[PDB]
Structure formats: structure tokens, C-alpha cells
């Protein structure tokens, strides 16, 4: 497999710290409701989902995570995290939401994008993965697929259609290709339209 360092995601989130949160603010309540209202104020045009992993820390601060959506798909690298103080006001927050023009749903409706198997092959070839891909794909429970007939992975590879914010700030329609090869466990974001370009690779394995 190739040097994956070249494919790392970017670090261009914003963190609005506790001091700046007070400053930037407009001059019991549920923490999820408080956080949701806050996301709507910061990003009034965004559609999003509340991630099902929110909790109150033993410090009394609640943490709520949001994932932006577009046309019924996740924008997989567009996140908002809201920390709610024990006083029920937003304490601090981070976000990487996309604020540009949202693409038409036409390409999705028309299904005008690559086969997930093409995405798997493009991933394997470009990254030079030690796996064999004379595979087939099968639907799962939303534009999400499992691959059969693949050799060299610890479990069946998968593909999910998402949007992805590229390094130039624009949205790509992409397959997120998951391949666990034990030494590395990869999420590869490969363009589903233009040119089959890889936009980023996440490795769950760290040294």
C-alpha cells in the first residue's frame, strides 16, 4: 500500500472557546434543545442530524455532536460539537459545517454516479491495497453497500454514499470505502463523479 500520510484529512475546524462564546453571543432547559437552537443560530441554512452519542460529563458539561446533511446524505466531514455548561447555556463549541452552495439532488435521483464496485476498485488500485477485488456489491439497511467476493480483508469491505468537503472548500459526491486489512483500517473518500479522485483517507489504526 502507498504512503497514506499524503491522503490525511485537513485540520480546518473552528473552535470558539468559552471566552469567545460569551463575546460572540447575541447581546431548566434540555441540553440537546439548547445545543440544537445554537446550531440553528450559527448555521441557519444547514440541515443536520443530532448524533446519538450525546452525554453529560462528570464535570457537569454536556456534549452534543451534529452531522450536517445535504439532499438526504451525510456531509461526512462536516461536524458541529456543542458543549453546554451546567448553567444550561452554551459553554463553547466547534464546527466544520459547510456554508457554500448545496448541489442539486438531480445526480442522486437520476443515480448519475459510479457503481460502488468501481469505487472499491479505484481505491484498491490507487492505494495499492493488498486485497483482491473481483467483487460484487449488495444493498444494506441507505446508499450503503457491502462487498462480497473480496479477499485480503478482516471483514467484508463496505461503501456508503456521502458528500465530502474537499481541500478547496467545495462539496464532492463521494463513496466512503471501508477496508479493514488489519495493518490498516481505512475509510477512503473517493469521488463518485469526476475522475475517481481520492479526497482523503482515514486510518483507524495508529502506532
Amino acid at each position: 500500500t502507498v504512503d497514506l500520510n499524503a491522503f490525511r484529512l485537513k485540520s480546518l475546524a473552528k473552535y470558539v472557546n468559552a471566552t469567545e462564546t460569551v463575546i460572540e453571543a447575541p447581546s431548566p432547559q434540555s441540553y440537546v434543545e439548547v445545543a440544537t437552537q445554537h446550531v440553528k443560530m450559527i448555521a441557519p441554512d444547514a440541515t443536520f442530524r443530532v448524533v446519538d452519542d450525546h452525554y453529560v460529563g462528570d464535570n457537569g458539561v454536556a456534549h452534543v455532536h451534529f452531522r450536517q446533511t445535504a439532499n438526504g446524505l451525510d456531509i461526512d466531514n462536516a461536524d458541529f460539537n456543542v458543549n453546554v455548561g451546567k448553567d444550561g447555556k452554551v459553554f463553547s463549541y466547534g464546527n466544520s459545517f459547510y456554508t457554500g452552495q448545496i448541489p442539486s439532488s438531480a445526480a442522486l435521483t437520476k443515480r448519475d454516479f459510479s457503481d460502488p464496485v468501481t469505487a472499491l476498485k479505484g481505491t484498491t488500485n490507487t492505494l495499492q491495497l493488498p486485497i483482491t477485488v473481483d467483487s460484487a456489491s449488495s444493498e444494506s439497511t441507505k446508499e450503503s453497500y457491502v462487498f462480497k467476493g473480496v479477499s485480503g480483508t478482516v471483514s467484508d469491505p463496505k461503501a456508503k454514499l456521502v458528500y465530502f468537503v474537499k481541500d478547496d472548500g467545495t462539496l464532492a459526491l463521494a463513496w466512503r470505502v471501508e477496508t479493514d486489512i488489519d495493518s490498516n483500517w481505512l475509510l477512503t473518500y473517493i469521488d463518485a463523479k469526476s475522475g475517481e479522485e481520492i479526497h482523503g483517507v482515514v486510518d483507524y489504526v495508529a502506532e
Binding site: 484529512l9 485537513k10 485540520s11 480546518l12 475546524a13 473552528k14 473552535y15 460529563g57 458539561v61 456534549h63 461536524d79 460539537n81 458543549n83 463553547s92 466547534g94 464546527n95 466544520s96
Partner: peptide, 9 residues
């Protein structure tokens, strides 16, 4: 770690 954004600097 629990406060910071995803992929922080």
C-alpha cells in the same frame, strides 16, 4: 479531549 472540535490544531 471531550470539548475540542473534530481534527483540532
Amino acid at each position: 479531549m471531550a470539548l475540542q472540535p473534530c481534527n483540532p490544531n
